[PDB]
Subunit: 418 residues, 3 copies
């Protein structure tokens, strides 16, 4: 277990270049199982989840290689059982199931891992795929899916909003016979990106980014080149880093329209924000943030993947702020870790009530999941003294070179063995 | 999203006439799928859930009409697949499954909605129906049930207490061959009402209201007229309205024996209560309540559907009071909303620790579920200033004309578009 | 509902003799379904769970008798459906399923009860058994398993650590054809004990106590005599009893190597500990404990079954201590009960933050589960005045003669009807 050792307080100031989105790179990598000619995916972050997906892909029979891009040749996929050891390490592995079924008529994928922030069922993926014509059973721990012949498109009303199940159904639909309509579709920018990737390959899709997507199945998808959009959560995290540290930053290679709610909330906190076409600047003008209220919800509302980060901002802000998490039922694990650093929070139900303090103290804390870990490192940067964040591998699932990026803003961080 | 705008403080005083029970009207409406002659159900509240059930019923092929009564002619039911869009909006839709199977040999119902106050599985309904002889599978999101021929009665020990699964098994049993015994049956007054409805139709049932119900199957049920019992929770809510507001009320068209535990607890809080045959009066004699301790449990203990309401009473009472919720695992969502109004609560596990304050403050709050919403409106009536309760549609699931009823007691409420 | 009435404060001092482990006696009793000659199991505690298991065993066709030992003759097992009424009362009943399948080719067991400290799924047991070749379905509430012929050994990587599913797979593997490897196996001392029991009977097992167990199936198991190891949790509870009461104790018939983490934590709390080969002594030298931090995890880390107990120690200790529960998601029910006795705890997520007080007060409290109940009795022993712990039957699931043992240390306890 690597740990980060952080020494504060430090103010965070400067610039950062945003990497491709974790959560777009991932569904695109799996969507490439559909492709029957080679694909190049540009602007792909170097993340643990990306490495594992490439390995998983390779074990199905794909030819895979990366640099700034990931190259995938999926023409000769010939294994339909995903490797369990890889699947259990992340959420995104669930996305092998859909394409394997749609293209090959069968697939077997065990239940995913990922962030331990809820029970995280996959029932809507399974329901969707069944509505498209698949037969599914859970056996030995695998989700085992099949269909004789093609899937058949269907009108599918999603019972609840779900990013991942939207991707599964949209992807599988691209090779079904007929038309699929997804109602109550997730609107996240990563589904738009995924959809636009698919279209590059020859898919017929419209409505992505709205609550309804329409897909007309085609016989085969081709190949192509596609560049992944910037990471909005990595963006938001670095904007929070400057905001809590009374700083200023510019974020380069950004996409500001994927952050409306976040930027507004940062303005509410007292931040001076400007945006251009592909960059965002934040300036606190030396001031401590003001407390804000937040309620998480699906895009384009305030994102659950920025909740932990805003927890911390509210805990060193001026005032009382209320943060309500509606999307996941166990995503306050960062809170007691913050309380070990002197924070004043109280949880009531799905809400953390935060009373901001001027300064935190250094402490031995432990990362529980990707965004909690980032949050605890940011805490360590502004806290007095030394913080040791244990189990920092979590961070590497979602941030390329966080240590380097933060270092470049002024942080004093060390990565340490154990 | 309609909202309520409330202006306080206001004292609540006067009288109210209690409507039929939400939670008896609902299972009776679905039980009427059994009937092979027309039925008249009297004293049926005008509630969102009732409207939806009538529409659902009509889509199966029933002829349905209402005024003070709902009229159902179920003779020509000929669709066995319930409409998903209606089913997802409420709990009660689960009750279409049992009667469809018992009478027609098949039925398909997707998973219900309703109050977001727990995971709310339906496994005991499915287990019960299987014990009666049904074959069940979950596929595309539906619970799909069938049996060749009649169900067969069985001795069924309910693994845990459940209102809804008691109703499902009791209802389905009425057309099975032989005798069914339900052990560990729920005893709620709405199951008694349901049972007595069924008996009006020709069912052979005994033991309702006790922990064991015995049903002897008959070949067919007929028709009839039946009046739904008063709503105990609407009763309790209005009694709490007067209790927290230092008031006095009489509740007309009430059934006081369905409220033993609630009335005792209201006496513990300092209320002067009297009861007659069909009415209940409460007088606080101008005083602020005293804090009480409460533990929810199945009937005839203190009901979970009054828990939110008593949360509020304890938060403006004199003293420290402990409220333990044992029935549902996510039914404290009203708590942080109350804390936004200045309440002093702390949650520990399944318990809210409440330290009563003299006055609340007006605040923008949001309703999460039916009884939380009612509670937040009551809070708004006694709070200083303006409260806006967002997402008030929740209330209309369970209260007919709440705005009008409260207005008649002195409240200053406005319903506002959005 | 029996209750305990406790009068404090009382200091707890003296000696105690530790009984056999609840949680080894239980899996061994069920493992004995494998045996085709008689078995004698020595040092078996007199516990409610043991009584129920013997009755369950007898209803499958075993001949069962006990004194200090339990005698089992399983040669004529001839019923494969476990009695539901017995199964629902405890966790351990799940362990009938594996042996019935491995030896007889079929078995039907409803879902277990036990401690209400989480959802407690059995999916890893079912997945494991399927990997060994079983066919499984859930129907009428039963887990129904079968295989034609023997099971076949498999390489099984356990998706998460699980004590019970490790036992199920290891036990069933003893009669499969070929070799089974369990990776990510639970290492608890009770799995070692179980494994060594099995080996007495002729099983071929190695690796128990490590994260990998290897089993080579044999054709039949025989009989034998085996003595159950001491109860580590009962040990830890009595060590906590003396620690919180500023006392001193010696624990006889103990196994100190099963308690490394606990003993270290007790040293951190200020305890003077000594150990011999089969005994442990603790002396506080008259002092109040110091607060400690704890994080639960699988063996050999700090055990979840001592978490409640250490909650209490931290709440009467000097200082602030943080207790993080990672194993079960609803195991803080003792906390509000402790708060009724004047404790200063706050829960945040999976962590209880404890600020120790000098003295508790007597209160009416209620036991929710086995280890919470023991904890509340210990609280009652050091609290000022009278404590009544309701629903004390929970204690009898895991402690033989707790009342007598504590009495012998100086406690003033009464067991009372209701
Ligand atoms: C790899 C990836 O893209 N991860 C992101 C994705 O996760 P993910 O796709 O897992 O999130 P979902 O939108 O599906 O989850 C939404 C809610 O729906 C539930 N649900 C989801 C699927 C299902 O079949 N059944 C079901 O009940 C979940 O338990 C959760 O409570 O979107 C989340 C919501 O923005 C982000 O936090 C994650 O970082
Ligand atoms: C429409 C209606 O009548 N609603 C009422 C009904 O709901 P409802 O019928 O849903 O409530 P239940 O009594 O069934 O629920 C009791 C507990 O058992 C669980 N459970 C229930 C069914 C099942 O198959 N499996 C299972 O595990 C539930 O998750 C809950 O934790 O009774 C509740 C308990 O008084 C009230 O709060 C609801 O307002
Ligand atoms: C009779 C007995 O021996 N009881 C002990 C046993 O319980 P038990 O065997 O039930 O505990 P487990 O180790 O299996 O449970 C570990 C975690 O894994 C989960 N899980 C377990 C099995 C499964 O199929 N699926 C699954 O998801 C559980 O919900 C829990 O969250 O070990 C626990 C952990 O030390 C102790 O607290 C219990 O006193
Ligand atoms: C929620 C944390 C991560 O983004 P995952 O969804 O597990 O990949
Ligand atoms: C618990 C809230 C409502 O009564 P529902 O059970 O959803 O109809
Ligand atoms: C966790 C409490 C008990 O040891 P059980 O596991 O239910 O036997």
């Amino acid at each position: 277990m690597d740990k980060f050792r952080v020494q504060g307080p430090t103010k965070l100031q400067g610039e950062v270049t945003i990497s491709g989105a974790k959560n777009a790179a991932l569904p695109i990598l799996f969507a490439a199982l559909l492709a029957e000619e080679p694909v190049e995916i540009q602007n792909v972050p170097k993340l643990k989840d990306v490495d594992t997906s490439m390995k998983l892909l390779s074990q199905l029979g794909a030819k895979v290689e990366r640099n700034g891009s990931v190259h995938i040749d999926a023409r000769d996929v010939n294994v339909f059982c995903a490797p369990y050891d890889l699947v259990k390490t992340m959420r995104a592995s669930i996305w092998a199931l859909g394409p394997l079924v749609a293209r090959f008529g069968q697939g077997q994928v065990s239940l995913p891992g990922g962030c331990t922030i809820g029970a995280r069922p996959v029932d809507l993926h399974i329901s969707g795929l069944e509505q498209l014509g698949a037969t599914i059973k859970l056996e030995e721990g695998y989700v085992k899916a099949s269909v004789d012949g093609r899937l058949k498109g269907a009108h599918i009303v999603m019972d609840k909003v779900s990013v991942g199940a939207t991707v599964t159904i949209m992807c599988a639909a691209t090779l079904a016979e007929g038309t699929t309509i997804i109602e109550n579709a997730a609107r996240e920018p990563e589904i738009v990106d995924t959809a636009n990737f698919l279209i590059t390959l020859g898919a017929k899709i419209s409505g992505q980014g709205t609550d309804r997507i329409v897909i007309e199945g085609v016989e085969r998808l081709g190949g192509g080149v596609y560049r992944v959009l910037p990471d909005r959560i990595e963006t938001g995290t670095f904007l929070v880093a400057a905001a809590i540290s009374r700083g200023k930053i510019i974020c380069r290679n950004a996409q500001p329209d994927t952050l409306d709610a976040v930027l507004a909330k940062l303005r509410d906190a007292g931040a001076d924000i400007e945006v251009g076409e592909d960059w965002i600047s934040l300036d606190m003008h030396g001031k401590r943030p003001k407390a804000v209220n937040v309620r998480t919800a699906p895009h384009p509302a305030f994102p659950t993947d920025m909740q932990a980060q805003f927890t911390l901002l509210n805990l060193v802000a001026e005032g009382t702020g209320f943060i309500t998490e509606t999307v996941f039922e166990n995503r306050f694990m960062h809170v007691p870790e913050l309380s070990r650093m002197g924070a004043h929070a109280e949880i009531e139900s799905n809400t953390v009530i935060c009373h901001g303090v001027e300064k935190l103290s250094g402490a031995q804390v432990m990362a529980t999941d990707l965004r909690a870990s980032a949050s605890l490192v940011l805490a360590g940067c502004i806290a007095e003294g030394t913080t040791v964040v244990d189990r920092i591998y979590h961070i590497d699932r979602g941030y390329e070179r966080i240590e380097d990026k933060l270092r470049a803003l002024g942080a004093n961080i060390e990565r340490v063995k154990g």
